[PDB]
Design a protein around this ligand. Structure first.
Ligand code: GDP
Ligand code: XY2
Ligand code: MG
Length: 166
């Protein structure tokens, strides 16, 4: 079956695992082992195509992992995630993208910028700010909540659409 290899990167606590697990298990986790990193597979129909998403949910851990290296190199699309109530997480984004540009040796990597925790009445990073970080990158911005699923399918499926047209 057609597959897409997706990688989810971003600062600690942005909700990378929560997003993954909403897409896959259709529920919210109120917390998660902050340190665990693996890939999960998920069947979805996207734009009418039956396919599998193989999603490495990264952790922040003191580098080297061969598995992590393998996904950073053969991964077709990256979700770059910050939380909209955490300005440091948003500032970090450029480190994550830059590491992806290095491992993929390209300025044109299927990516999507995700502002998670859109449910919160806690916003510190304004939407237009992220629109502009994304536009400058030439990639889409999408705001999500793992708590309510708003934007989640859209984050992932826009990423697939970016992998396809690459
Ligand atoms: N309100 C809210 N909390 C979230 C959301 N996503 C994650 N969280 C919380 O943020 C914390 C970090 O989540 P986690 O998935 O471990 O983040 P990770 O370190 O990026 O994998 C946990 O307490 C989650 O319950 C979200 O969309 N909304
Ligand atoms: C942060 C955390 O609680 N974990 C990494 C525990 C295991 N999780 C989140 C997990 C395990 C297995 C599968 N799976 O088989 O597909 C998951 N899919 O989303 N989260 C999964
Ligand atoms: Mg995690």
């Amino acid at each position: 079956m057609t597959e897409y290899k997706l990688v989810v990167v971003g600062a600690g606590g942005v909700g990378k695992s929560a997003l993954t697990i909403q897409l896959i298990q259709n529920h919210f986790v109120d917390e998660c082992d902050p340190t665990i990193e693996d890939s999960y597979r998920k069947q979805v129909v996207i734009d009418g195509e039956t396919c599998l998403l193989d999603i490495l949910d990264t952790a922040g851990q003191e580098e080297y992992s061969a598995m992590r290296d393998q996904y950073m190199r053969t991964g077709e699309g990256f979700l770059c995630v910050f939380a909209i109530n955490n300005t440091k997480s948003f500032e970090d984004i450029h480190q994550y993208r830059e590491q992806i540009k290095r491992v993929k040796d390209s300025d044109d990597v299927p990516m999507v910028l995700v502002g998670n925790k859109s449910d919160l009445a806690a916003r510190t990073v304004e939407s237009r700010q992220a629109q502009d970080l994304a536009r400058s990158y030439g990639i889409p911005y999408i705001e999500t909540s793992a708590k309510t699923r708003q934007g989640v399918e859209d984050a992932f499926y826009t990423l697939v659409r970016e992998i396809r047209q690459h």
